[PDB]
């Protein structure tokens, strides 16, 4: 799925 704003 969408997850372009990064990892956390």
């Amino acid at each position, epitope marked *: *799925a*969408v997850g372009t*704003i990064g990892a956390m």
Partner: antibody
Amino acid sequence: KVLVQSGAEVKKPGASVKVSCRAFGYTFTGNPLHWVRQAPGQGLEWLGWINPHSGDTFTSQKFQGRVYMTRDKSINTAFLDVTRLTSDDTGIYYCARDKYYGNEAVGMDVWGQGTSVTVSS
Amino acid sequence: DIQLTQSPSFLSASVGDKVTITCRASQGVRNELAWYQQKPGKAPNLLIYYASTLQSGVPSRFSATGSGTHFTLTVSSLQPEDFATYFCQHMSSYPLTFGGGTKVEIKR
């Protein structure tokens, strides 16, 4: 656990509104925050989401250049700026945390009580 | 964009009925779909994610399945609390999109 949003707002056409959203009971910088709005009687519309740790954002294409997501980590608060308001922006604005399992969108876990925005002369 | 059609939009059923809601996706969204329940006056509540996994605290009467473009949500036996409006949502590409919603009303 809990997302607390700011109070209702009444604005004239062409004005701007700043809604705020504060996080409680979990690490503010551990989950993306979505922004979703609902016009009186209608369905849900996604505005964008923000990485509270980095401030990175993706704003929904329909609203790019008109809606701005920011955050203040020192007080676990996220901000949504909606500019150049028309009557099409009247409705309730929600902030919602994403579970973000696997570093990837999964579902909107925790919602705020919502902020009402009325655009009218 | 990428639209989700919910069928039916309005549904009347009485307490204890088994009911099934359908979400159809304009494009393939492999498994990346969620279901929400919203009562008037509230923010939505998450019921299902990964198209079929129950969110913590959701009663077992709720269940859902779905593959690619056809998804369904089912309540085995409706309860007073289950009467509300239900939305599907995908997260396969930008922008995230919700279905138009299904309002489930008490038949009397």
